[PDB]
Amino acid sequence: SRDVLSTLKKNNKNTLLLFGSQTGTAEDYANKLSRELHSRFGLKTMVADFADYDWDNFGDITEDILVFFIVATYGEGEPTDNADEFHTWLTEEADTLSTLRYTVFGLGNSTYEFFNAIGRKFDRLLSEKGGDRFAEYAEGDDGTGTLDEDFMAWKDNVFDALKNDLNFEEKELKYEPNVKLTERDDLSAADSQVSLGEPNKKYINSEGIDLTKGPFDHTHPYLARITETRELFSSKERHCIHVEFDISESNLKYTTGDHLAIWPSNSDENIKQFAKCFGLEDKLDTVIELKALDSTYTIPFPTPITYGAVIRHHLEISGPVSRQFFLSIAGFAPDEETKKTFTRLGGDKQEFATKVTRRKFNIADALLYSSNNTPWSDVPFEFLIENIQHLTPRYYSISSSSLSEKQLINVTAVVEAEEEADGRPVTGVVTNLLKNIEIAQNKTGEKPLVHYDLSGPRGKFNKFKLPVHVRRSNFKLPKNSTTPVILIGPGTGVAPLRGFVRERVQQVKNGVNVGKTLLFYGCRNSNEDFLYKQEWAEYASVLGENFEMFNAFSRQDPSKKVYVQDKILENSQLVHELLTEGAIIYVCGDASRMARDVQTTISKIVAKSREISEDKAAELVKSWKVQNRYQEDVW
Ligand SMILES: Cc1cc2nc3c(=O)[nH]c(=O)nc-3n(C[C@H](O)[C@H](O)[C@H](O)COP(=O)(O)OP(=O)(O)OC[C@H]3O[C@@H](n4cnc5c(N)ncnc54)[C@H](O)[C@@H]3O)c2cc1C
Ligand SMILES: Cc1cc2nc3c(=O)[nH]c(=O)nc-3n(C[C@H](O)[C@H](O)[C@H](O)COP(=O)(O)O)c2cc1C
């Protein structure tokens, strides 16, 4: 079953699309491309997760299979978890791939140093080992906001290659469903086999199954009770939530520095606007059953299920709208005046960006703009199941210590929310869910901007439970507790660093010899947004002279805006002294600006302190990253 070649043949497929994805974008692109290849070119396509196959025989792939690799870069130039075994195979075991025909699209972000390392590496190694690159490599940049249009441009070039180099006939895009829906008017919420949004089918049967026992992963979460929450900012307009999850009654395990994945549900406001857009407002309790029309299509949620459960618990209805979604759905436009507007917007990259993307429209808002509020009632709900990405967990840096509190997981989440001039709320799904929980749990009297179902499917999320799982990270304290560490994490970057500090505090209490800990923190104003302000002196009391903390306030004084890199420079003698003692550097938080400014500042310190050029020092600091002496948890 893990032989991909045998799987292609058995399913009568001639086209393989492989996705390396951590948060689902690469998977969604592979699905989008697959459907278009099938409709426009008649290709018999299979979308595959690298993790579902073993790769030892892949060198035997035949010339009649076209392979598309859609691959994200993660961590520090590393493969996505699902692609790790393929990456080990290609880099270490693969010999030749003499009849492979392939093309690669990389997903990455140019604010990271190893930009699109994986797409570039796959594309190069596949060629070096004898593969035939049939369409040029291209890559997308999530750091500058061009990723989606980069993908569209690459896809256009792939289609040119198919049509003009391989002489395939290209037909017009048409919706060719891979799934069939049937309404079950005989079923209702009263029927226990009907999903009301449970995370998977194990949560629907579960009469005498232990839902507290292992293992928990991206296919199977633990419903973790939130025992307490706290608003950490004093600002009325900007919020950050401390969350404590009780895991004591379960086999869910974590280690300091790991990530918690929180499984979302959508807000009432976004659901309402989605149902209005598609004429589903009187159908939300109606039960549907889904059947695959293609032997390699996996229905992405339990069936049977209600429309409302699919929309609330399974579809990523919010977020930037791909122009490819406009192109795919245009055939279902409700009327001619709409089709004219919608076809124009879908075909013009720049006007799409101005009229849809920069307004931060969700699907529902963009389609209703285009149709002057006429519902898109001709859109088959199957089309939406296939063309909107599955609602994916968000990761949080755990802020508790597994040594100190093995039975609790903390996270520290800044809430993303704004209102547009036209009154629309533009919200982060998970973070507004956590804010709603904090408001309700603490009876705060704040009015939530958007609202969620805090009880969940059949009341199964009651007493403020959410589905979670833990992802193991390589962001880890040194094996040797006497090794000094330098911890840099302004804003929510402090989250894993709180975990680290709490671990070292407990270690000192366990009579362990712990090395020096230097922490560089920053926020706007000591009286506004200083995370965990009270705790740090308590930690200092335990750790003694083996802990020093320096704080940078960016807004306290307008004449002197101060950031963590300014405090690192001010304390350069100490920082470098610790580096000479083998200190490990950990940088956490904002990838876009902070991480790069900090790295530059550290490089300058190394250059001055060691009498080497700035570029030689920069290259040395880069080698520390490769060697895991300089670690990042930046997003
Ligand atoms: C390894 C890792 C560790 C992390 N650690 C932490 C941490 O410790 N703490 C923390 O706070 N975060 C952390 N994050 C970030 C976190 O995973 C989330 O990305 C963040 O909390 C936002 O999630 P959300 O569901 O609220 O927002 P999302 O729903 O993903 O929305 C993202 C943004 O898009 C905006 N938006 C919504 N709709 C639209 C639209 N139509 N057009 C344009 N924009 C729109 C939202 O308002 C928001 O600003 C980490 C990320 C990673 C990868
Ligand atoms: C924690 C983290 C680390 C990342 N590391 C890199 C990197 O080293 N190089 C890069 O080009 N992009 C990097 N990215 C950008 C992702 O590849 C990019 O957001 C991509 O679109 C995600 O695709 P996915 O949703 O399929 O996982 C990183 C993103 C995150 C969140």
Author numbering: 45 to 679
From the paper:
Cytochrome P450 reductases (CPRs or CYPORs, EC 1.6.2.4) are diflavin oxidoreductases that supply electrons to type II cytochrome P450 monooxygenases (CYPs, EC 1.14.-.-). The structure is well conserved among the different kingdoms, possessing an N-terminal FMN-binding domain that is connected to a C-terminal FAD-binding domain via a linker region. The enzyme transfers electrons from NADPH in a typical order via flavin adenine dinucleotide (FAD) to flavin mononucleotide (FMN), which ultimately shuttles the electrons to the protein acceptors.
In this conformation, the FMN and FAD moieties are in close proximity (~4.3 Å between the 7-methyl groups and ~3.6 Å between the 8-methyl groups), allowing direct electron transfer between the flavins. Electron densities for both the FMN and FAD were well defined. The interface of the FMN and FAD-binding domains are stabilized with various salt-bridges and extensive hydrogen bonding networks, suggesting strong interactions between the domains. No differences were detected between the two structures, with the exception of the presence of the 3′-phosphate-adenosine-5′-diphosphate part of NADPH, which, in contrast to the FMN and FAD cofactors, is bound through mostly side chain interactions.
